[PDB]
């Protein structure tokens, strides 16, 4: 049966009654390697790279040479295609399934922050996600993050993985630490390290100064001097926090114990919204266990 095989669903290649024929083969998420070619006449078949043309084309689309990627990608795709993606306040979320709470919180965050992905696979799926088709994008996140369906995940970890696979070259951060004995030292962060900070949740507290230790046991302060990024992520261990409307963009809510809780998404619009997969809850002021707060920026210069 004359059929079409592909590695990226972009460049298509036109190739008896699948392992001996093509190797590991997939058709819409399902592993058909142990099947025989009927209704599968002319359909596009995902195959593993086995020639140089497909090996080089696989890097053009996925920017990876790991032979496990496609297998881990189609393995996650079998579940994500069965997931439901409701539109909650103009945003695509995921109904609870296979411990996808941290994935849904990451999907809502990405729809509200500016990010340009370097791999065309992530970028092309990023556009399809905002439109409503978030299956191919959720599976790709699991593949790039080396995570599997059902495994427990962390929002700060998953975002950090994606941030490295994205264009944050123009993102700079000029920090200044001063010591009561050593003196004043200036540091500059560029890329993924310039948009993230684990420690405090308040962007204003980062500007006013945060107490950190130097080589000397004496306490030093670290304050932000210059920031040049479309957004910043502020992270801290889960504690109680009051989120004021208009002072932030979106925030992540973790409830439970280490590697044992449940993630919830909070966003700021005309009023504070709380998304729990397919559920919605409004509030004027919010207070709860917040672990990550996202703030929007463009250019900031300190007064000190
Ligand atoms: C869900 C999940 C999946 C994977 C995951 O991987 C991380 C592994 N890396 C290193 C490969 C982590 C998490 C997770 O829990 N993250 C949340 C946000 C989190 C939660 C907590 C936290 C709550 N209560 N307590 C108390 C407690 O546990 N007692 C028994 C009293 C601790 N502390 C944290 C401290 C630091 C960072 C995150 C913390
Ligand atoms: Cl690369
Ligand atoms: Cl499922
Ligand atoms: Cl869950
Ligand atoms: Cl990349
Ligand atoms: Cl903001
Ligand atoms: Cl949970
Ligand atoms: Zn070709
Ligand atoms: Zn790349
Ligand atoms: Zn499932
Ligand atoms: Zn990678
Ligand atoms: Zn010193
Ligand atoms: Zn010092
Ligand atoms: Zn208000
Ligand atoms: Zn959960």
Swiss-Prot record:
Record field: catalytic activity: Thiol-dependent hydrolysis of ester, thioester, amide, peptide and isopeptide bonds formed by the C-terminal Gly of ubiquitin (a 76-residue protein attached to proteins as an intracellular targeting signal)
Annotated consequence of substituting residue 135 to D: In strain: Alpha/B.1.1.7
Stated name of the protein: Papain-like protease nsp3
Function field: Responsible for the cleavages located at the N-terminus of the replicase polyprotein. Participates together with nsp4 in the assembly of virally-induced cytoplasmic double-membrane vesicles necessary for viral replication. Antagonizes innate immune induction of type I interferon by blocking the phosphorylation, dimerization and subsequent nuclear translocation of host IRF3. Also prevents host NF-kappa-B signaling. In addition, PL-PRO possesses a deubiquitinating/deISGylating activity and processes both 'Lys-48'- and 'Lys-63'-linked polyubiquitin chains from cellular substrates.
LRR repeat segments: 107-129
Record gene name: rep
Source organism phylogeny: Viruses, Riboviria, Orthornavirae, Pisuviricota, Pisoniviricetes
All copies of domain Ubiquitin-like, residue ranges: 1-47
Full protein stretch here: 1568 to 1877 of 7096
Entry membrane topology: Multi-pass membrane protein
Location(s), subcellular: Host endoplasmic reticulum membrane
The protein's assembly and partners: May form homohexamers. Interacts with N protein.
Listed result of changing residue 101 to S: Complete loss of PL-pro activity
Activity regulation note: Inhibited in vitro by GRL-0617.
UniProt: Zn(2+) 6 binding residues: 179, 182, 214, 216
Effect of residue 67 to S: In strain: Omicron/BA.2.75
Organism: Severe acute respiratory syndrome coronavirus 2
Residues annotated as the enzyme's active site: 101, 262, 276
Segments forming C4-type zinc fingers: 179-216
Residue ranges of domain Peptidase C16 in the record: 61-304
């Amino acid at each position: 049966i004359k059929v079409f095989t592909t590695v990226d669903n972009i460049n298509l290649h036109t190739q008896m009654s699948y392992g001996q024929q093509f190797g590991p083969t997939y058709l819409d998420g399902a592993d058909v390697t142990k099947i025989k070619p009927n209704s599968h006449e002319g359909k596009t078949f995902y195959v593993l790279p086995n020639d140089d043309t497909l090996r080089v084309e696989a890097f053009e689309y996925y920017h990876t040479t790991d032979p496990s990627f496609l297998g881990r990608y189609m393995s996650a795709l079998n579940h994500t295609k069965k997931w439901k993606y409701p539109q909650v306040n103009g945003l695509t979320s995921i109904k609870w399934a296979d411990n996808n709470c941290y994935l849904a919180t990451a999907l809502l965050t990405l729809q509200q922050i500016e990010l340009k992905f370097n791999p065309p696979a992530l970028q092309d799926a990023y556009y399809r996600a905002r439109a409503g088709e978030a299956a191919n994008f959720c599976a790709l996140i699991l593949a790039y993050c080396n995570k599997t369906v059902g495994e427990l995940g962390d929002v700060r970890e998953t975002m950090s993985y994606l941030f490295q696979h994205a264009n944050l070259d123009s993102c700079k951060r000029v920090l200044n630490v001063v010591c009561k004995t050593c003196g004043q030292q200036q540091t500059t962060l560029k890329g993924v390290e310039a948009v993230m900070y684990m420690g405090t949740l308040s962007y204003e507290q980062f500007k006013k100064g945060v107490q950190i230790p130097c080589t000397c046991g004496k306490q030093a302060t670290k304050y932000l001097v210059q920031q040049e990024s479309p957004f910043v992520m502020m992270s801290a261990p889960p504690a109680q926090y009051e989120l004021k409307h208009g002072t932030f963009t979106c925030a992540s809510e973790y409830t439970g114990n280490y590697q044992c809780g449940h993630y919830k998404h909070i966003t700021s619009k005309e009023t504070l919204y709380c998304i729990d997969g397919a559920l919605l809850t409004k509030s004027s002021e919010y207070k709860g266990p917040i672990t990550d707060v996202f703030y929007k920026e463009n250019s900031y210069t300190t007064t000190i």
